[PDB]
Design a protein around this ligand. Structure first.
Ligand SMILES: *[C@@H]1O[C@H](CO[C@@H]2O[C@@H](C)[C@@H](O)[C@@H](O)[C@@H]2O)[C@@H](O[C@@H]2O[C@H](CO)[C@@H](O)[C@H](O)[C@H]2NC(C)=O)[C@H](O[C@@H]2O[C@@H](C)[C@@H](O)[C@@H](O)[C@@H]2O)[C@H]1NC(C)=O
Ligand SMILES: *[C@@H]1O[C@H](CO[C@@H]2O[C@@H](C)[C@@H](O)[C@@H](O)[C@@H]2O)[C@@H](O[C@@H]2O[C@H](CO)[C@@H](O)[C@H](O)[C@H]2NC(C)=O)[C@H](O[C@@H]2O[C@@H](C)[C@@H](O)[C@@H](O)[C@@H]2O)[C@H]1NC(C)=O
Ligand SMILES: *[C@@H]1O[C@H](CO)[C@@H](O)[C@H](O)[C@H]1NC(C)=O
Ligand SMILES: *[C@@H]1O[C@H](CO)[C@@H](O)[C@H](O)[C@H]1NC(C)=O
Lengths: 243, 243, 243, 243
């Protein structure tokens, strides 16, 4: 997370950390609890190949990464079938936990947006995670969970921005409809934040607008952060996660 | 180049090295001389942003990188307009040299294939470059140009290979018509070889079949190297490069 | 610490961590509380030059590095005058704290040995720290304080071991009287442990026998860990630290 | 080499490069040809343990490292017996080649100094090598042999300099009689230059005064480069190398 501050302990009860077995259970991506037994994340977090499930764990909300771990094994990994190597469309996946977690004030699910919510410019949104605090600048120990308020940029304007200083034809769409843009050159998500949540407060309720996916650099001029647009994948999510 | 040998001085007179101004004019990609004044390379080599031409130079055929350099300036870069960030299609670009090179037996152009050549399995083809000799293993000093014979894999067979061990739907195409596959778990191109040529000996004549583009790993089982298919872009190339 | 286990919370109340101002107060050496206002460490830890004390902090016994830090500034540093660069004798120093720490069962001083104690082979001794767990292998997050029992090796036996496979003449002493040897190819201290304590249980009382100093590799065959012998410098220590 | 310039091809016909087998024959230190069959270098270059000779090679003078290598195997390694791990005295070693080398104007021996030559301040001296051009800044390809003129600092003055900003007792000698000091904050040898020659022109003749050994940093204020004083070891050298 670039340009943000440490999250208060009572915020983002749905934030999770994905861990891979490598000398220790190392964080590699974020995710969000969307049901007592399901985690939402990015397809590229669990790629490029089908993973041996024994090598992965999920950690529910922690103010400081690694310090009070209670790691949870995963029962199944479901990656959107339209997703493939070196491309950013359909960057979404689900992790079914072996067990349903206890829901509480400190740990609980985030609501998915209704299909009609477009999350227009001006909407108040925050992206959270334990990722880099700047390009190639990792979050220092004790690894506090960070948050940053990011401005939403309308898709067409965002697509135009991505064409500035690029070789791509004006009529070639970089930012697609299953994507959402947020951030500026001072506030953004970054490497290490992938798969985590972009949430917006709509009429007093927190809704998950996006999943951290990609961007050119982090907080780079004319390059807003790109998120998988959750509303676009609600039917797919609903095939697996119960109401 | 993975699994090859150092190239004889008399081979591959069209091979070029692209250089970026660092603490030295460091090699970052390959290319091929297809006209006395034009170099063919990969779009991602001169990406992601429009380049300041002052930071780039071209080095024509030399046996060892950096030793007997004679760097040439670039007057123009043309990247296929369909090309954009974090996607692999249309990975092709042209570099116009400031001056046409003096053609000799040691340095000359490579012939482009006729639109009808498909380069089917069994065709003898070589890929050349100064790239990594293994995953994360750079070419050691004195940086000899290397070559390796790589087996062609038919596109659909190759597409199926890339679905092995992947979450991608069988109906979702990974390998496209503007791509060509070559290489196996013993012989392949790698990071540092991008933009360079894959040439095949077709009934007595060398024809450039592809441009090193991407792959999962280098010489990784079931993941052949992927090249931009030259015949697919002949019309685009001929729009800029004279007869 | 190579070959040990995480230490119980009730153990080693005298252990301290020395911190340097980087992007965070990063751990670089260990030390021991030998008086409520004095920390004992290795001279090379506070070298090569006279330090700007604004760049250093002391952290008393904590179970995990960086988590519940309560950093203390250093009033002054006193390095043994016989110590100099690229030489390993007289590797010992004292850090005076601004004020005395509150002594409790979880944080208290370690007893220094009486001048006559030689700590011969067979003595049960432990070395503790947050250093590397193998050669070039840092302690993984959450950075638990580790401990390992290390076997003592008599000095001359140790001196002979260091001549094995070395060009040094047999009459040239490598291990000196102000040094103590401990550890084997399974258990040892390592980089990051320097300045920390080697304590032995003597007739029911823990006494600090040495200060982690140097060695060839960590847990390397025929290369036991080398420690500054505390009894050798009691007079120098008592010149600053009250009884 | 810090400061200075690339050497004319006609200078330093005695410079050699020591290579270790590591993916390629990698340069790790310099040396000097002091007899058609003997190379003089630093003991620490061939430490810390007795080396398997199959892993070492010597390369005679070449303008650019790695490019026109003609590697030579070593028959014997003789390290001064007073030298030992982590200490800087007696930093001198000899390598006997399997065969005598051909002597020419471009490749020949450097003369050793008479025992009476003290190389006092004011003497014109140059240090040469392929090492770092600044702290942690390696020589870039094509790796030209570099040279720099360095001023001699009298031993006592030098010893006093090394006490400036250090904790060492004024009466504790850092710079010893078997050492020689040369260089300043603008001109110096560095990592990668060890074992190479410091030569001074005396009454029109080049004599090897020192062997690159150590220093605090490279070209660091109040820290001249420290060399093994060749005259101090003439008897030892003469026990093995024919006059
Ligand atoms: C799920 O929550 C159960 C109930 O926890 C208690 O009530 C909650 C509302 C909350 O206030 C919590 O802090 C309370 O502890 C847990 O069971 C309880 O576990 C504690 C020990 O951690 C034990 O002292 C209680 O007797 C026990 N009560 C019950 C209803 O059994 C679950 O813990 C698991 O089940 C326990 C029986 C035990 O096997 C423990 O090791 C298990 O983790 C909570 N489950 C999880 C996944 O944490
Ligand atoms: C040692 O030098 C011999 C003579 O070198 C030649 O004369 C010099 C004055 C100079 O002009 C130099 O450039 C010349 O090459 C070498 O022998 C010569 O080697 C060359 C091939 O390298 C050959 O064509 C010559 O006929 C031959 N002449 C003689 C007098 O033998 C030595 O080379 C080695 O020995 C050779 C016989 C051959 O086996 C070659 O492969 C060897 O390298 C030089 N020795 C070394 C170790 O370099
Ligand atoms: C928010 O609430 C107001 C008042 O109830 C309503 O008019 C508006 O449409 C609501 N917006 C959304 C996105 O539900
Ligand atoms: C250099 O030459 C001069 C004049 O011949 C002589 O006096 C001086 O001592 C010589 N120095 C050496 C080292 O020979």
């Amino acid at each position: 997370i670039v340009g943000g501050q440490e999250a208060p302990r009572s915020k983002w009860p749905w934030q999770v950390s994905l861990r891979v077995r490598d000398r220790y259970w190392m964080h590699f991506c974020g995710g969000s609890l969307i049901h007592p037994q399901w985690v939402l994340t990015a397809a590229h977090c669990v790629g490029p190949d089908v993973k041996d499930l024994a090598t992965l764990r999920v950690q529910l909300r922690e103010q400081h990464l690694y310090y009070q771990d209670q790691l949870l094994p995963v029962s199944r990994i479901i990656v959107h079938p339209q997703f493939y190597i070196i491309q950013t469309g359909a960057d979404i996946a689900l992790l079914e936990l072996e067990e349903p977690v206890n829901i509480s004030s400190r740990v609980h699910t985030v609501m998915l947006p209704p299909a009609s919510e477009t999350f227009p410019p001006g909407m108040p949104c925050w992206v959270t995670g334990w990722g880099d605090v700047d390009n190639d600048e990792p979050l220092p120990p004790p690894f506090p969970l960070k948050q940053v308020k990011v401005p939403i940029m309308e898709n067409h304007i965002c697509d135009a921005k991505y064409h500035l200083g690029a070789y791509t034809g004006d009529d070639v769409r970089i930012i697609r409809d299953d994507m959402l843009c947020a951030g500026n050159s001072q506030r953004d998500s970054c490497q290490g934040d992938s798969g985590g949540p972009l949430v917006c407060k709509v009429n007093g309720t927190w809704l998950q607008a996006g999943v951290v996916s990609w961007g050119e650099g982090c907080a780079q001029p004319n390059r807003p952060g790109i998120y998988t647009r959750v509303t676009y994948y609600l039917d797919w999510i609903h095939h697996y996660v119960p109401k």
